[PDB]
């Protein structure tokens, strides 16, 4: 019967709720007292990357912490040098509705997908000079929300038809397919060892997946609305979120429940992308009221504000060495906040 | 300028990339980006056949004006999470089939098909993004609308109608049930047109109504309005 299975599933929901309550002996906010607070961190705009002409919807730092791809809502995908703010490439995309962007961690490839449901993969370091499309990864139904390279041949593209996927670039077919979400998937983040990834969604639930196994390890819940930001802790054992009830939550993969919450009562707006710092002490979350504000990650004190943008900060990225923070907004500028 | 011979020639690449974005940000500013919304079973395919995956950009020129229409009906995803991509369109072309006033949708409980295209109309007028973007509204299939209003009245879809089973007494009733769904009578205009087989004068309506939007958007950009 369909009725007795819903009679059973809530008991398993009542068993996971009891098991997480058997482990919540001490809150993180009371363990993370009796330590030094981080104090106010002020970060000034060091660069402004100007050349876009529409809403920057995504960016991704290249793994050398100097290059920077940035997909915006014209047909362009500009690869910025950051240290002397030149444009290394400008890649005219085939559909100008791109909701995501990814720099491959070898430097060679760059992917961007969007409302065309297709994850085009570009080959920068080539022989004939110009940046060339190597693949167009079809096969999703809804819009693409986030693309992430594991290496130069696997890419994890979470789309909006309630499904993530794992691709093989050299062939062009989905190897696995991570389903189990209700409602859209809005952002993913690979673990720093690239074995697991989480995937925030529009049913207020992140979900820890395994790229080798093929289905969900554990499903986190606790938000009130659409989760549209995910960042792993740099340890790779916890992860933040960000949602449209204007609150972050630091979850944990080993305790299977959220550890703290990041809400100020003077913000009501919603979150577009979060990102930890190096060492996992800051939780720089990008909000709809045009400002990032650096939460301390252990105590919920809002330890600064990166207001320099004239519209919604819709993409946020900390370098792989932690030397700078690049945010990009719905006005076409992309300020780098060292 | 303490730049090397290659650091100088890298900036010359950045300046000749900038000169190709600004030269392609003027081929993109000359074009008019519409947005063909509408519910299912309306006749959006009647209109993109009258002119010329997920999104499908349709290009067509009229009187040296290059248009672009984005039919997002093939998305089948949540409309909330990508409708801010079209925040700066010129004019939301809407489509309402007049002929679905007596048809129903089998999925939801009551689900008059006209009652949901009215509810999508209220959901895109009153978006926080579509404050300025003036809706062009195409009431499709008025020729099929006469050949079933002489049989069946509009009192099915709307109890609050007091009139006879005639076209003009009721086709203008639907327009005044649509033009008042916006809570912004001051910020945007709703242009309405009754397309059946009017295939010459539908792009002419869009060229006139976009030129009305282009003029009023200029006169606020100058401050004069």
């Amino acid at each position: 019967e369909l009725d007795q299975l819903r009679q059973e599933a809530e008991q398993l929901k009542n068993q996971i709720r009891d098991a997480r309550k058997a482990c919540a002996d001490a809150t993180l906010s009371q363990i993370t007292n009796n330590i030094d607070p981080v104090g106010r961190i002020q970060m000034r705009t060091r660069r402004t990357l100007r050349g876009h002409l529409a809403k920057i919807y995504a960016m991704h730092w290249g793994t050398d912490s100097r290059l920077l791809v940035s997909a915006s809502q014209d047909g362009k995908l500009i690869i910025w040098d950051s240290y002397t703010t030149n444009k290394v490439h400008a890649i005219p995309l085939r559909s100008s509705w791109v909701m995501t962007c990814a720099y491959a961690p070898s430097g060679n490839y760059v992917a961007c997908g969007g409302l065309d449901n297709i994850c085009s993969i570009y080959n920068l370091k080539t022989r004939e000079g110009n940046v060339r499309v190597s693949r167009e990864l079809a096969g999703h139904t809804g819009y693409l929300s986030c693309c992430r390279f594991l290496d130069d041949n696997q890419i994890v593209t979470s789309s909006g038809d309630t499904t993530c996927a794992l691709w093989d670039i050299e062939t062009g077919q989905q190897t696995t397919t991570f389903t189990g979400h209700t409602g859209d998937v809005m952002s993913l983040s690979l673990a720093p060892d690239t074995r697991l990834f989480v995937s925030g969604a529009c049913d207020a639930s992140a979900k820890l997946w395994d790229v080798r196994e093929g289905m969900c390890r554990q499903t986190f819940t606790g938000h009130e609305s659409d989760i549209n930001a995910i960042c792993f802790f740099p340890n790779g054992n916890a992860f933040a979120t960000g949602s449209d009830d204007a609150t972050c939550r630091l979850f944990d993969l080993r305790a299977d429940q959220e550890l703290m919450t990041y809400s100020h009562d003077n913000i009501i707006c919603g979150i577009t992308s979060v990102s930890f710092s190096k060492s996992g002490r800051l939780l720089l979350a990008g909000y709809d009221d045009f400002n990032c504000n650096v939460w301390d990650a252990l105590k919920a004190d809002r330890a600064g504000v990166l207001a320099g943008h004239d519209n919604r900060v819709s993409c946020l990225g900390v370098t792989d060495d932690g030397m700078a923070v690049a945010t990009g907004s719905w006005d076409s500028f992309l300020k780098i906040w060292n | 300028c303490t730049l090397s011979a290659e650091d100088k020639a890298a900036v010359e690449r950045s300046k000749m990339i900038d000169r190709n974005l600004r030269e392609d940000g003027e081929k993109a500013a000359r074009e008019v980006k519409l947005l063909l919304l509408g519910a299912g079973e309306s006749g959006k395919s009647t209109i993109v056949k009258q002119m010329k995956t997920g999104i499908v950009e349709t290009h067509f020129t009229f009187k040296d004006l290059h248009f672009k229409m984005f039919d997002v009906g093939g998305q089948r995803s949540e409309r909330k999470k990508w409708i801010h991509c079209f925040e700066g369109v010129t004019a939301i072309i809407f489509c309402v089939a007049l002929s679905d006033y007596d048809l129903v949708l089998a999925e939801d409980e009551e689900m008059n098909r006209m009652h949901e295209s009215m509810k999508l109309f209220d959901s895109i007028c009153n978006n926080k993004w579509f404050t300025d973007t003036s809706i062009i509204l195409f009431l499709n299939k008025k020729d099929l609308f006469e050949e079933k209003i002489k049989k069946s009245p509009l009192t099915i879809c709307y109890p609050e109608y007091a009139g006879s089973n005639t076209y003009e007494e009721a086709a203008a009733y639907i327009q005044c049930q649509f033009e008042d769904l916006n809570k912004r009578k001051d910020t945007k205009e709703i242009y309405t047109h009754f397309t059946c087989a009017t295939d010459t004068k539908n792009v002419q309506f869009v060229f006139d109504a976009v030129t009305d939007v282009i003029i009023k958007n200029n006169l606020k950009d100058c401050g004069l309005f």
Partner: single-chain antibody
Amino acid sequence: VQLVESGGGLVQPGGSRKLSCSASGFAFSSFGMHWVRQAPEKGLEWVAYISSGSGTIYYADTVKGRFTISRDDPKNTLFLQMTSLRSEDTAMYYCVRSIYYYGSSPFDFWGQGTTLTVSSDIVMTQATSSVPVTPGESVSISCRSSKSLLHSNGNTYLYWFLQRPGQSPQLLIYRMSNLASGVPDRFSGSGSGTAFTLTISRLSAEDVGVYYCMQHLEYPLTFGAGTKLEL
């Protein structure tokens, strides 16, 4: 990807000739192109330069004012009109391509090179003779500038070229330590400042040829006289 060259012949001194190279196989309009000549018993020597979009043209001081480098980017050809040529302008005139962005490899492709016979500044000091060597041997080929090549941005602009004889030189080490695409990994460059070494750890007989170093800090743009290798 090739860069074939036209022109060539035997003009009288005071005469003129127009070299042209037809570049095909790459997006030519975004490549800074060069002209590099090689006197027939001697090493390489730099002649002219045109940038992407022809927006910046340099010349060497020996051929400044007489030579005019130009190109037609829709035609995918690069010219060099030489006027009032001397008897020291007899050389094989290679064409080079070089794209400059962050992390690019300039001078990566060299043309065939047409001989143009005529009828009769950083200095790079290699100074090493035709070294006889057995394969499998670690060879250190050392160049030495007259300036600290390490720029303020941390890049050391030294390039290492292998001209196998009968061919055009090809890039090996496209900055201080880097390696061109296609060079086997046994080649390695080392050093900083003024003293640089190209160390081929494993050897063969296929990488025999003469080895030029080149600086790239500023557009004098001189080559070293090549350390010849032989078996």
